[PDB]
Amino acid sequence: GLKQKIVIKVAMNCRSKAMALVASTGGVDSVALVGDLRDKIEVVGYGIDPIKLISALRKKVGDAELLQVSQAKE
Amino acid sequence: GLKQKIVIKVAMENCRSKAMALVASTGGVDSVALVGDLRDKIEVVGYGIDPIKLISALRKKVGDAELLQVSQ
Amino acid sequence: IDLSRERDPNFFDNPGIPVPECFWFMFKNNVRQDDGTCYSSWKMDMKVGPNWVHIKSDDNCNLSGDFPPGWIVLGKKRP
């Protein structure tokens, strides 16, 4: 499971800004707005530091909370 | 109004991050995924995405960009 | 709580990795808080109210984890 799945709740046009910031991170394969309110970003990639990502989001977009970290599997 | 899937091939020589940022910031976008073994294609899903402007943007600010797919 | 009659989660399957087998739903006093997908016969770490919980999936997408009081996350089949 070399690839990580990270789900982040963001106070969120903040959606486009939050999406651009995460999309621009090194190792990213995908970003997706998920949940019924589209108030979550799921990122899949390699060598992504969730702590740096949450910090980037909080200084740039607004409140953000790590919700889910799992591996992908083959 | 209809759920669209758009695949765009982009030159991208870290032009990947700039390209993913741009698409990810476009109106009506729900998801952006690097696809193909060489991760040289962007797959975009959403509602009300304009593929003509999206392509214009990518050519203007990242380089050669080609429409491979539009479906819904 | 009843998963047969819960609206399917708003999901995105990355094309570069296998499709996750399970939908999941998080409740506090039965009031749906959250949802998403996960791999069966697997595991994830999830923020469940105050606490990080290491949630195990079996191959029928059943989810075991030490959930804080008044919280649960439940798993199931995707079509």
Author numbering:
A (entry chain BBB): 186 to 197, 201 to 262
B (entry chain AAA): 186 to 198, 201 to 259
C (entry chain CCC): 33 to 111
Quoted from the paper:
The rice NLR pair Pik-1/Pik-2 recognizes AVR-Pik effectors from the blast fungus Magnaporthe oryzae, triggering immune responses that limit rice blast infection.
Interestingly, the Asn261Lys polymorphism found in Pikh is the same as the first position of this double mutant. Overall, the binding levels of Pikp-HMANK-KE to each of the AVR-Pik effectors were very similar to Pikh-HMA. Previous structural studies showed that the side chain of Glu262 is directed away from the binding interface with the effector, and would not be expected to influence interaction directly. Therefore, Lys262Glu may affect the activation of Pikp-1NK-KE through a mechanism downstream of effector binding. Further modifications, using PikpNK-KE or Pikh as a scaffold, could further increase binding affinity of the Pik-HMA for AVR-PikC to a sufficient level to confer resistance in rice.
